Design a protein around this ligand. Structure first.
Ligand SMILES: COC(=O)C1=C(C)NC(C)=C(C(=O)OC)C1c1cccc(NC(=O)NCCCN2CCC(c3cccc(OC)c3)CC2)c1
Length: 461
């Protein structure tokens, strides 16, 4: 066989695997214990995170050490029971994690669409996790059924006359049966769901940008649920939405019952106000793009700075903002500090300083730091970025082993060498690291958990 694996690699790997056990097993068990006993911190997202780290506890116990030890041997010393479970319990774990991450993305998407009235009773999450586990066990079953432990190796193993040497290998009906199962598993259970997860998180980001523009105008133009007479003298409702220039209150009430399409009687809801504000934002955007002066300036700006421009259109109008000739020129040319000086030298700034000072600070920094009251928008931005990073870390971790496994499923004829076993252990370890990314991203990036894990570890002493 001309084979020779060095002990300089073996011990370094044993240290690396042992580190991923003590960081994984403890971290995933700490994440569970904290969320479980800490009631009210056990929300739909957190319940699915406990389910996610429970599967990562199984692959760390049932699969991780047995695969490493078997690789360094020409025979399976753990029995038929541990042999058949190895690909099954690993597959179930990848699948449960995939669907639990899918469910988290759907829950986060429902929260960004409707945060006000979304009060979910955890029973739908318990229903989800049960369906996920039944779906995972079912789809993974052929690995358990077709994994074999026979003392009849395909290849020459080292002689041992006193004991019968057994080998743990996959023995599917045929190569087409194995390859067909494996390719739709990889496509429909790995790539497929992941694509959908990223689709949701993109849709979350897009709807969050439009709701950030809502919070900006709420603080400035003001959110009113009753038909009120504005500075001009005409009837308005919500965030500066004009009904009619008609002086009759009943004539103005008729426009609201037409805009909403419901018998309002002068009173509308918080959600009803956001729906019309978003329509005005689109109407303003359409106008800004129709405006030759304001179109190159809007196109130049980022999401935050475009909102500062929209806030200005909502206040002065299109002909109003167009009058800021030299200031818009500077904003177009990305001179944020120079433009902040010029926008303060206006008749707009002197008249409405409180609003202007905020709009100017947003045009200079390019962030919602001017509107510090909006800290609720800043928190869910951090949570969704962390949750997306968990998905990417999961996808990247398993990707080298997923490639190694398919490459050798199509090239099943190829004999396992010392170079293959080293490459496999480097892929297996990277995949095993996914067990650690769940508590490290939910600990060192989550503010609630980092202080809580320290007030539990030091409390034990
Ligand atoms: C829903 O997503 C999934 O279910 C999976 C993903 C995403 N990610 C991994 C790592 C999987 C896994 O661990 O599932 C249990 C399965 C999966 C995917 C594709 C393909 C496969 N193929 C097989 O298991 N073939 C059966 C043959 C497996 N052999 C791979 C090579 C290995 C080996 C080991 C040492 C040296 C070698 O050199 C030739 C070869 C021996 C076992 C699995």
């Amino acid at each position: 066989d001309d084979c020779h694996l060095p002990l300089a690699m073996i011990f370094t790997l044993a240290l690396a695997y042992g580190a991923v056990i003590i960081l994984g097993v403890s971290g995933n068990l700490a994440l569970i214990i904290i969320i479980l006993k800490q009631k009210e911190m056990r929300n739909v997202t957190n319940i699915l995170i406990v389910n996610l780290s429970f599967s990562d506890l199984l692959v760390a116990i049932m699969c991780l050490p047995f695969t490493f030890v078997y690789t360094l041997m020409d025979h399976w010393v753990f029995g038929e029971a541990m042999c058949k479970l190895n690909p099954f319990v690993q597959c179930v774990s990848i699948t449960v994690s995939i669907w639990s991450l899918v469910l988290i993305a759907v829950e986060r998407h429902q929260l960004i669409i409707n945060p006000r009235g979304w009060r979910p009773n955890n029973r739908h999450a318990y229903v989800g996790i049960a369906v996920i586990w039944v779906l995972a066990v079912a789809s993974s079953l052929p690995f358990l059924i077709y994994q074999v432990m026979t003392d009849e190796p395909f290849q020459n193993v080292t002689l041992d006359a006193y004991k019968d040497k057994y080998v743990c290998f996959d023995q599917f009906p045929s190569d087409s049966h194995r390859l067909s199962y494996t390719t739709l598993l990889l496509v429909l259970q790995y790539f497929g769901p992941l694509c959908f997860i990223f689709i949701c998180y993109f849709k979350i980001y897009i709807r969050l940008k439009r709701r950030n523009i809502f919070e900006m105008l709420r603080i400035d133009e003001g959110l009113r649920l009753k038909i009120y007479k504005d500075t001009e003298g005409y009837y308005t409702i919500g965030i500066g939405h004009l009904l009619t220039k008609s002086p009759s209150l009943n004539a103005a009430k008729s426009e609201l019952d037409k805009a909403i399409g419901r018998n309002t009687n002068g009173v509308i809801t918080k959600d009803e106000a956001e729906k019309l504000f978003n329509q005005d934002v689109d109407a303003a955007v359409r106008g800004i793009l129709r405006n030759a002066k304001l179109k190159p300036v809007y196109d130049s700006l980022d999401a935050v700075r475009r909102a500062a421009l929209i806030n200005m259109v909502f206040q002065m109008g299109e002909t109003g903002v167009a009058g800021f000739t030299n200031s818009l020129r500077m904003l177009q040319q990305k001179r944020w500090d120079e433009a902040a000086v010029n926008l303060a030298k206006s008749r707009w700034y002197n008249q409405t300083p409180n609003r202007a000072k905020r709009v100017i600070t947003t045009f200079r920094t390019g962030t919602w730091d001017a509107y510090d009251n909006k800290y609720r928008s800043s928190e869910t931005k951090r949570i969704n970025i962390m949750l997306l990073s968990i998905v990417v870390a999961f996808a990247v971790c398993w990707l080298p082993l997923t490639i190694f496994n398919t490459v050798f499923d199509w090239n099943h004829q190829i004999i396992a060498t010392c170079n293959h076993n080293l490459l496999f252990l480097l892929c297996h370890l990277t995949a095993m690291i996914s067990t650690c990314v769940n508590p490290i991203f939910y600990g060192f990036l989550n503010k609630n958990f980092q202080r809580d894990l320290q007030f539990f570890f030091n409390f034990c002493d």
